[PDB]
């Protein structure tokens, strides 16, 4: 009214639009701060950083939204993280490799990265909201980003009758993390396990679209530097992603494959036998070489823990902490490429 004039002038058709207009990005103090908070290059205008915050659930047009920008950025993130794991840990099993990727470039970490940037969400999308807010509608899950996986003809039976799905095929059919493909309104309600997945998905597409924007404006090297600064900089203990089943058989199969002497468990130390909390220190040898060692309060557990640590040492072999990546050869003026170590594959045992 007369006493409460509007703070930000807006035409009457503003609320009708799904997302704020591009020119509105030039009057938002949240955008300008976000653009500088990330030290983005001035080549990326504010109208482009604003487009990275509009999810396809808020604006269904192919433009004005995150769809295409996020797809390009996802391909860059997944690529730079994939080649980086195979050069730092070339012996990781395929299952552990899928979890390592999902632990860096998955919806969970990207949600934490988007929040690390100070990006607040809009309650409900519309042309009246601040362009500096992440816009999306968690009530509409009918939006999905394009990927490179295919739908399995037995997906219906995979979920109902618990049919078996192998690992070798997840590289061709499933998505980049091993997940199968294709797995008025009233706001008087509470959250849902679906709205959380829709919100977590929106934050992920934003972080991806930012990488795609840098690639479109700055170039390839700038995108790799951004991924290498905010994603690869995170910390992850891959040893905690391992879950073994009969590790004593897998270690016996490993020694047999590499032609090592059969593994023999030996008691290196012990104390408290016939007590409530003993300590048996068992070490597994292949001849005279000590492969792994584990200390537990039982003889069997100490033998299993020793075999698990022996298998982790094999899988967690690392040529270096900061190894060269094949992507470095695209940057002109680089030294000749030295062949990397290619492992045979994880051991398959009874």
């Amino acid at each position: 009214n007369d006493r409460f004039p509007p703070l930000e002038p807006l035409p009457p058709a503003a609320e009708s639009l799904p997302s704020p207009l591009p020119e509105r990005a030039l009057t938002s103090a949240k955008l300008a701060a976000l653009h500088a908070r990330l030290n983005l290059s001035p080549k990326i205008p504010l109208q482009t950083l604003a487009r990275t915050l509009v999810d396809a659930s808020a604006d269904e047009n192919p433009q004005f939204n995150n769809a295409n920008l996020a797809f390009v950025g996802q391909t860059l993130i997944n690529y730079h993280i994939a080649e980086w794991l195979l050069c730092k840990y070339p012996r990781l099993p395929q299952g552990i490799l899928f979890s390592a990727m999902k632990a860096y470039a998955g919806p969970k970490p990207l949600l934490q990265i988007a929040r690390s940037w100070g990006v607040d969400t809009a309650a409900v999308p519309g042309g009246e909201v601040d362009p500096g807010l992440l816009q999306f509608d968690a009530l509409k899950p009918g939006v999905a980003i394009t990927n490179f996986g295919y739908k399995r003809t037995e997906l219906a039976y995979l979920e109902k009758f618990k049919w078996r799905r192998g690992m070798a095929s997840r590289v061709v059919l499933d998505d980049d993390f091993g997940d199968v493909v294709r797995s008025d309104v009233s706001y008087d309600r509470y959250g849902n396990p679906d709205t959380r997945a829709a919100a977590e998905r929106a934050h992920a597409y934003f972080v991806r679209a930012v990488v795609g924007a840098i690639y479109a404006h700055c170039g390839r090297e700038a995108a790799k530097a951004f991924v290498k600064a905010h994603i690869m900089s995170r910390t992850l203990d891959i040893a905690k992603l391992f879950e073994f089943k009969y590790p004593t058989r897998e270690l016996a199969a490993l020694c047999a494959r590499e032609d090592f002497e059969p593994p023999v468990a030996r008691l290196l130390s012990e104390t408290g036998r016939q007590s409530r909390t003993p300590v048996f220190v068992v070490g597994i040898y292949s001849g005279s070489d000590k492969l792994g060692e584990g200390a537990a309060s039982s003889l069997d557990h100490a033998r299993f823990k020793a075999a698990m640590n022996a298998l982790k040492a094999w899988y967690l072999y690392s040529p270096g902490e900061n190894p060269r990546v094949p992507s470095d050869m695209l940057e002109e003026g680089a030294k000749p490429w030295t062949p990397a170590y290619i492992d045979m594959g994880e051991v398959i045992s009874r």
């Binding site: 040893a239 023999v264 290196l268 005279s288 537990a296 003889l299 557990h301 040492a313 094999w314 967690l316």
Partner: protein, 161 residues
């Protein structure tokens, strides 16, 4: 104590004697093998590839075995024809020709007998029931201890124990 500064001095533990013999007139690199368990990232030389140049004599060189706990021996006492005898017998009378009876008869492990043949579905359900009936005889104190033993095993294989 009265203040945190005094409490820190009463709980003080000196550094390791290796760090006390400091050098003079220049820098120095000493061999300080700690009394601790090593991480899985210290890959043993046997697990390094033949190309990896980091393979090198022990640091000690750059400056009998313990008792046996588990050394099994694999045996193959069953022939392709005896495997069929194990299958017809197990299906003829799973009560009499148990896996223990067939194991001792053919001099095998109880597991191998189960790898060659399985009892009919009817004989298997009564086995799961027999183990479920004895479980309902447990009190709250014994049922909780049994569940803890099943969780510690799972936690162990997850790296949590």
């Amino acid at each position: 104590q009265s203040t945190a500064n005094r409490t820190k001095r009463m709980l003080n533990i000196p550094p390791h004697e290796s760090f006390l013999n400091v050098p003079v007139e220049g820098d120095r690199i000493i061999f300080n093998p700690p009394s601790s368990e090593a991480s899985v990232y210290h890959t043993p030389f046997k697990f390094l590839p033949r190309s990896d140049p980091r393979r090198r004599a022990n640091i000690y060189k750059l400056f009998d075995l313990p008792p046996v706990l588990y050394n099994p021996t694999k045996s193959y006492n069953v022939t392709p024809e005896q495997v069929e005898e194990i299958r017809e017998l197990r299906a003829k009378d799973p009560k009499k020709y148990s896996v223990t009876y067939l194991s001792n008869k053919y001099n095998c492990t109880k597991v191998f007998i189960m790898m060659c043949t399985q009892a009919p579905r009817e004989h298997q359900e009564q086995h799961k029931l027999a183990r479920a009936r004895t479980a309902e005889n447990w009190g709250p104190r014994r049922a909780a201890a049994k569940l803890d033993a099943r969780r510690r095993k799972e936690m162990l294989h997850r790296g949590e124990i």
